[PDB]
Amino acid sequence: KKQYKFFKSWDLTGQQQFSLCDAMRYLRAVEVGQPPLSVKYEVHVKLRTKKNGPVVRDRVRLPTPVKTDTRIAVICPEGSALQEEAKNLGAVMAGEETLFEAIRSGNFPFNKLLCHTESEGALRKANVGKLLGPKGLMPSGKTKTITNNLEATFRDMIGMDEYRERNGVVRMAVGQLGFTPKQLAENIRVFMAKIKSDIGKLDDTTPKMVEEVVLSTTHGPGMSLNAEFAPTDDKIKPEDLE
Amino acid sequence: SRIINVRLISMAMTGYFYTFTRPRTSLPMSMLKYDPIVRRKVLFLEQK
Amino acid sequence: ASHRMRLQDQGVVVRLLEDIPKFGRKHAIFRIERGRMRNEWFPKNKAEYMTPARFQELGLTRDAIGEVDRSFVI
Amino acid sequence: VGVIRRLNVVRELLNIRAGPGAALLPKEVTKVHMQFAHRIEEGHMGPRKFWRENLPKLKYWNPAVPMVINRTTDQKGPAVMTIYFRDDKDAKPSSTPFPTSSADGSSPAPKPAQGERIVTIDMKNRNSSVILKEFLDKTGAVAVQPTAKDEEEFREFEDLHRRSEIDRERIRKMNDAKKREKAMLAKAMSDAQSI
RNA sequence: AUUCUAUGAUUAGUGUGAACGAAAAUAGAGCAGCCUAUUAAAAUAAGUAAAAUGGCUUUAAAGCUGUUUGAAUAUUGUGGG
RNA sequence: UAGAUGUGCAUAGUUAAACCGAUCAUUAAAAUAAUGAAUAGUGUCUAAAGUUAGACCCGAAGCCUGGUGA
RNA sequence: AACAAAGCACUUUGCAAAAAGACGAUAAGUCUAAGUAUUGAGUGUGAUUUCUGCCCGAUGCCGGCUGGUUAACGAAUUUUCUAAAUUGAAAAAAAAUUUGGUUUCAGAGGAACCCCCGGUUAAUGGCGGCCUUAGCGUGAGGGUCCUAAGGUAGCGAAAUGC
RNA sequence: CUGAAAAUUUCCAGUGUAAAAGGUAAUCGAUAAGAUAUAAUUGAAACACCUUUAUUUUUCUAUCGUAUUAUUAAACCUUAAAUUAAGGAACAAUUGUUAGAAGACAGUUUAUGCGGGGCACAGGCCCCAUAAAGAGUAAAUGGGUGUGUCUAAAAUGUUUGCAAUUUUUUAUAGUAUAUAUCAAAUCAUCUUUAUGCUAUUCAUAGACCUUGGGUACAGUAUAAAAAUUAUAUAUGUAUUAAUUUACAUAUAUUUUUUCUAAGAAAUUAGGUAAGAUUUUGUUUAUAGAG
RNA sequence: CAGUCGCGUAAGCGGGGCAUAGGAUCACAAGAUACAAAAAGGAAAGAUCUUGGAUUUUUGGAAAAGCUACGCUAGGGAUAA
RNA sequence: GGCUGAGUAGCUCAAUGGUAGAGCAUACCGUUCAUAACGGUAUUGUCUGUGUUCGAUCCACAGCUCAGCCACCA
RNA sequence: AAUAUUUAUGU
């Protein structure tokens, strides 16, 4: 008989919350041997909002690509600052004379192939065009892959992430299991911040407030995430590994 | 009624204001009026 | 919640003298309903009012008031 | 769903730090690379349970030890375990290359580097307990002891499982009669509504 | 100290209005101080001060009060105004 | 002997009011820019008056309180 | 011709400390009554013969929901001023937070009356139309609208008739 | 919607009773088969598993409310010098507070105007006549379909043959004038100097065509631009280390602001400037047209 | 007149509409001013300026239904039979 | 200013996420030896607009109109 | 073996 306007909000005083570092220490353990690029983090932000109100339908461009459908690989000098930069942009197996043998292996993880104008010489020397050709991945002037600015090329082909507000929660994948605590941390900042902006400009009659945010993996428990980032265990420091 | 008395607040944050009437089914008023506190013409915007 | 609520009486302080069961042991100080002490305990000499003068003679302070023990047994 | 509903779930699932197969490996070990098949045929059940029961606990207490697992669809394969126990005599110089877990033989056991005299382990048709035993003793880890509250956690949830199953049968039985009665009356009356 | 008369004062102030209406202080009539009270009394004051609420008084304070509740221990800064 | 004592009104105006002051008020800063406001009081008697009291005089039906009578 | 009246009818009263009703600045208490449902009180009608029809919508009363509403109470909220402290500011400076005093806002739930359902006319009260007809009239009859129901029996230029 | 445990979601079709969304390709089976799921089919939407959410339902806890029971086991009430009695009983009763409620009772209002009063009707304001050639001027006088409104104003630049508009900057000569230059005002004119196309002519495997090169000399202007983007895909052909590259088809796009009439629409009413100055009716004539 | 904006070459024009038909105080509410602050430092409550809500329509501005043939008093014949 | 209910064909009324119906008031036909009854059919379509969903009389918002009590009532 | 709708009219 009776009805309620706002979605039910549960008291959070009891909730044991975890810092991002401490939280990852648990999720990484459950995902001990799973493929690192198939297991992806995800966030469930609970918004205190009315039922008959509008819903968010904006997008976001995260610092690092999440969707793995388009796996990028950059042919750049080895050990160069750009080689590591490619990893920051989300590159896979990028570098010099690192995939060239993979192109000879006959199995390619990457779905697309970039070759910086500087490394163009090594490409012809490799003489692997006859192998990349039939696959439709051979760079060319018309391929728009021989570029001097990698970051710009990355933002163009990847795109953006779409998040839609459902009944009472916004759900979107933010990180990949192979993310470092620094990368994943910033990736979340760009997420909750963008929501706050949209929520801010949405309307003032009934502003929506983020009640709780839950972090979970594909095969991990949904744990409440605390604003803190540093680990509570003094002995344990930020560790990075597969 | 069909008419409402709106208040245009000074954007100079001086507290001065003007009061005009306009139909309800109309856009909020926004005019360039004279502020006697600063003695200059500033932008006045509807309160609500 | 509000800034003003209905005024209530928390009871009267009394010291047991007969080791009443379900309430407390002998010489136990606590607050009890004014009705039980006035109609049942005091006439039967089972307890005594803890007046400010009584606190001085016994040497105790006002901070020695306990609570009723419903689980007490002889 | 409530805050306490989920807490009782995650906390229970938070047995990664518990008794069975939990220890702090010495500083001499750097990483490990296991390799088994998907199915359990041909002595492949043992290695799997170790990966889903005990191995997850080793990562928590020692999260700086890469533990990659390669999977293959070619059963009757090498079900071995290469424990990078050396660390080049506690030498900091790191070996750049190391693969990552996957599903189809993408990461074969990498060959040891110069200062990488490693000890291997075999496991086929062998119980996980035997695998775990040889793992701890050979690696030389110091088992962690669960504190009081940890042992309290087991006791609490153990009672929940009692009441839980006690409620499963009840609500299941209450639905047994409901579904049964609804079918009997339906089989009786509606059989006439067919006409 | 109290009491009586006048001024202060058709004032402050209250009240929609009509109207109601202080005190300080001053002048005069009298003048007296005490608890060992010039007639036999206190071991210095607790259901009291005070609060909420219903009223009186009133300027909202102070004062009076039914109901329900309910403190502190002296200028070495305790209590009222 | 000496000192003090005893309502009040006027002597300076101005403004809502204070500061200010032969100047003051308004001009969101001020400034002769304008406008408005400045010069014998006080006591007494005679008389006519305003106000409050019965208030120039006579005259209701009625209202309330306390008593009286079958 | 008005009142009363015998008769008639309705409502009320179980008496266990107060039967109801009436009186009592207001109580104890008194009358009722040293009575007990064939008693007492209240209301209308007004011996008797022959009779007392229809309507419970409105109004009043009675009964009824673990219903709706719902003051007090009250879960959850909120504010003025000021003292001290912290933070902030540390330029001519506020401001913010916690605590003390002081003073406001505030309402999930939550009574009766009321809303809602049913009952009651010797309760207060109400008790209509418009067409058509076997030939003109007259309607046994028929159709239709409306209402809670539509003035029945009887009486009828009456104390009621312009 | 106090919280916990468990469970619960049917149109048709669909394996069948699909809660919704996000992520994922495997998940379980103690060592051997198999169930599950991805595929496949249906449907708008597709399933295991892991997360956070939506609706509803039992028990437990929690908060409210109703009812009953006990009480010389000395609340209180009633009988009773008044008790180890009887009955009632946490109700009743009383006090305070709060809400409702009988003209039972109390105070007061119910006006005034009006060719007497009663009923009715009337009360501010605007225009015209009455009004007597200043102003003013009454009557329950004559006119009125009078009126407590509406209104924020809007949807290398510059035409290619040459000092040609206004104002200003700067410089030179010059003694204040003169020229050039700069910026602004007025105005979106569209700008590839030829990379395509067209014609003709050589070669050229070729039985008219395939492939690659030349040629054209332009005022009766010209083949020498009547409008020239960029791609995504598929299907070819020819090509290269290479979907490399160049063409030919089609179909989805964007680009050249360049092709679905706002100069075909909206009754916008103030300040100021400029422009227009009989707009209405009448009347003559005019396909359908009275 | 001062302040400072608009249009116009300029002169100059603009303190709403071609003219004639929309009620105050008090209280309340939103802003400003820096006057006073009941021992003192603050404040409350006040004062000045601007502004808003009125069939306050008996519109110079009361929250307001009747009977009397049981009737009463003061007047008027300033209005009747 | 705050909150709630509401209307479907000419007339009177049903249908709750899934077809848009029933009865009546004319008319045509059928049934009957014939008439009256009876039977069948026909149209006249969710107050208006917008939005959410594969799908809207149905849910959400605004308005028309009706209705509940409110707010102001200096 | 104890069933039971409705059927008026005809110078």
Ligand SMILES: [K+]
């Ligand atoms: K005064």
Ligand SMILES: [K+]
């Ligand atoms: K009679």
Ligand SMILES: [K+]
């Ligand atoms: K009736």
Ligand SMILES: [K+]
């Ligand atoms: K009734």
Ligand SMILES: [K+]
């Ligand atoms: K009824």
Ligand SMILES: [K+]
């Ligand atoms: K309430």
Ligand SMILES: [K+]
């Ligand atoms: K009759």
Ligand SMILES: [K+]
């Ligand atoms: K008893």
Ligand SMILES: [K+]
């Ligand atoms: K204009």
Ligand SMILES: [K+]
């Ligand atoms: K003319």
Ligand SMILES: [K+]
């Ligand atoms: K008479």
Ligand SMILES: [Mg+2]
């Ligand atoms: Mg109590």
Ligand SMILES: [Mg+2]
């Ligand atoms: Mg005096």
Ligand SMILES: [Mg+2]
């Ligand atoms: Mg004393």
Ligand SMILES: [Mg+2]
């Ligand atoms: Mg007191």
Ligand SMILES: [Mg+2]
């Ligand atoms: Mg005080």
